[PDB]
Design a protein around this ligand. Structure first.
Ligand code: HEM
Ligand code: HEM
Ligand code: HEM
Ligand code: HEM
Ligand SMILES: [K+]
Ligand SMILES: [K+]
Ligand SMILES: [K+]
Ligand SMILES: [Xe]
Ligand SMILES: [Xe]
Ligand SMILES: [Xe]
Ligand SMILES: [Xe]
Ligand SMILES: [Xe]
Ligand SMILES: [Xe]
Ligand SMILES: [Xe]
Ligand SMILES: [Xe]
Ligand SMILES: [Xe]
Ligand SMILES: [Xe]
Ligand SMILES: [Xe]
Ligand SMILES: [Xe]
Ligand SMILES: [Xe]
Ligand SMILES: [Xe]
Ligand SMILES: [Xe]
Lengths: 141, 146, 141, 146
């Protein structure tokens, strides 16, 4: 369960990501598609070339959603309501895949912001992304 | 795939008793009811609005019959599931775009259906054998993904 | 989310199980240990053979916890709090195993309920066991 | 597990840069911090009360050194992981009672630690190669369970 110390850590770490959030969202997808090829089954329609506009757009949108969740960490179900509806009713991404993206975001952050990626921050970010994933899959059935 | 002789005998013995078309329609319908995000691949199949509609839908039942018929055929090839399912694996990746986690969900549902139908005869060791098999089939269907 | 229809289905199914709950809990563990042998790593202090009274005892305890969860379906975190503490802080069962036991309890229920284990009831029971599992793992970190 | 020649090359090349004791202590400490239920085996190791105590605990770091030393040696056997880890698999099942999901958690922590330590060099394709390896090692360590 996400604690208020975790909340503080995530606000600090995501605040430090700052303007790089969309870039890092895109890189997390790029990493996921290579490490976990089955996740490409959800993007048969995209150009998955490095640096594509579609991957960068997806990364920016996902980053904005994460920024919204970080700013609203005590009201995430409400903050992410449109997205939990979209994933439950339309996209219908198997819940297992959220773990894979989350791990790839952690790797991306570790690779780019090592000073900030302390053990405690790693633990808080992992918990936070698990929470986001739970919210996004909460309306699946 | 490596099965003990108790396991492979348990699988084949139970399977000869199975009404494959019926179990296939039942398992596939339950997949769509229990894990309704799996309906994403079946937009054209008609009414999937309620459990009774899903279970009674002729296209769902026809899909379950096809799927479990292929599963049944594979049970003759328990020593080389990867080779027996390679063509269908590539189809499911390249054409149908099906996340292989779906195969694992179906395996779980199929185990529940066999338990429901056979009752006490679906003993813990018979279930264990079937768990091995459904895992091996899902792994084989996932093998050609890239 | 546990909807009123899901709650109704769960209460009906577990009412039918009735006094057999402990027996079914033991059978679920037996099924899990055979189907998923890694789960035996949590019970090195047990005779895990068919009919073991230690497995019977464990099944009764878990069944009783589930009966209590059903009786408190609107107030489940508090009802299960001591068990959440115990699993988080002492037993420390990896979360993946709750999925495995949940599936084996569905299989057990299916094997004993020809009429009652309908598709709708199966779905509600799976949702319920996932919710119990979430509560039981909520204090792990 | 199926590593391309270039993936094997990439694994071997990055690993030649690793201080195994250092990375082992970091990865094993982070395992215990991020996934604290893994502490269950280490009641005898002293202070695990805070992230700094875990990371700085001499017993934790000695365990990480031993674990990652064995992992390191296994990278010479990418063609035979099941064989190279068979005796450790049996020990972890039969005597240590370690759920193999712990190996998968360690694998993912190790990937994060390699990213943390290597920065630019831990590119998406290098990560993908290491994901295959940690999965293969966890699978090999799980192989003799029964
Ligand atoms: C942190 C977890 C996630 C968040 C916050 C998130 C958020 C979003 C957002 C903001 C959108 C854009 C919606 C729009 O354009 O209106 C989206 C779309 C989408 N997401 Fe998710 N998502 C997450 C995880 C995943 C995962 C794990 C997958 C699959 C592996 C996935 C697959 C998709 C797909 C297929 C689309 C539609 C893309 C398109 O056609 O443009 N998402 N998501
Ligand atoms: C794991 C066991 C499975 C086997 C052996 C299998 C086998 C088959 C077979 C034999 C076909 C017919 C191919 C043709 O006539 O061209 C098919 C089609 C298809 N399968 Fe699979 N399948 C399996 C599981 C699944 C699952 C779990 C899903 C998704 C939830 C899925 C999705 C599809 C789709 C979308 C089609 C095309 C259906 C249509 O529009 O007619 N399959 N499969
Ligand atoms: C529906 C999910 C579960 C419930 C409701 C549950 C409930 C319980 C209860 C009521 C006890 C007895 C506590 C006491 O004696 O004070 C217990 C003990 C225990 N449980 Fe859980 N449990 C669940 C899942 C699991 C799983 C998945 C595992 C491992 C695979 C597990 C492993 C253990 C162990 C090792 C003990 C201690 C047994 C002993 O020392 O006698 N439990 N659990
Ligand atoms: C890369 C994966 C792993 C490898 C290669 C590995 C290897 C080893 C080795 C070489 C030993 C010493 C064996 C001996 O003394 O003969 C050992 C001991 C041990 N390992 Fe593993 N291990 C792995 C992961 C894990 C994980 C993730 C856990 C649990 C969280 C674990 C728990 C233990 C325990 C409890 C001991 C005994 C420690 C002691 O007695 O001080 N191992 N491991
Ligand atoms: K992962
Ligand atoms: K048909
Ligand atoms: K976990
Ligand atoms: Xe992301
Ligand atoms: Xe994308
Ligand atoms: Xe985040
Ligand atoms: Xe994410
Ligand atoms: Xe970070
Ligand atoms: Xe099926
Ligand atoms: Xe399957
Ligand atoms: Xe039931
Ligand atoms: Xe039960
Ligand atoms: Xe149970
Ligand atoms: Xe037990
Ligand atoms: Xe239940
Ligand atoms: Xe359960
Ligand atoms: Xe390690
Ligand atoms: Xe590993």
């Amino acid at each position: 369960m996400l604690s208020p110390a975790d909340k503080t850590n995530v606000k600090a770490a995501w605040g430090k990501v700052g303007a790089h959030a969309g870039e890092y969202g895109a890189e997390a997808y790029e990493r996921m598609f290579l490490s976990f090829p089955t996740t490409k089954t959800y993007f048969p329609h995209f150009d998955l070339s490095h640096g594509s506009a579609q991957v960068k757009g997806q990364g920016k949108k996902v980053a904005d959603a994460l920024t919204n969740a970080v700013a609203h960490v005590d009201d995430m179900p409400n903050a992410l309501s449109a997205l939990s509806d979209l994933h439950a009713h339309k996209l219908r991404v198997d819940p297992v895949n959220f773990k894979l993206l989350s791990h790839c975001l952690l790797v991306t952050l570790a690779a780019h912001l090592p000073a900030e990626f302390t053990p405690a921050v790693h633990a808080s970010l992992d918990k936070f992304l698990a929470s986001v994933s739970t919210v996004l899959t909460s309306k699946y059935r | 795939m490596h099965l003990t002789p108790e396991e492979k005998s348990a699988v084949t013995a139970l399977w000869g008793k199975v009404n494959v078309d019926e179990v296939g329609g039942e398992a596939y319908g339950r997949l769509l009811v229990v894990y309704p995000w799996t309906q994403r691949f079946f937009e054209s199949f008609g009414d999937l609005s309620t459990p009774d509609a899903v279970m009674g839908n002729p296209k769902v039942k026809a899909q379950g019959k096809k799927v479990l018929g292929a599963f049944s055929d594979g049970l003759a090839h328990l020593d080389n599931l990867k080779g027996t399912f390679a063509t269908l694996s590539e189809l499911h990746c390249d054409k149908l775009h099906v996340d292989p986690e779906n195969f694992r969900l179906l395996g779980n549902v199929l185990v529940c259906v066999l338990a429901h139908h056979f009752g006490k005869e679906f003993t813990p060791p018979v279930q264990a054998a079937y768990q091995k098999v459904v895992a091996g089939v899902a792994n084989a269907l996932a093998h050609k993904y890239h």
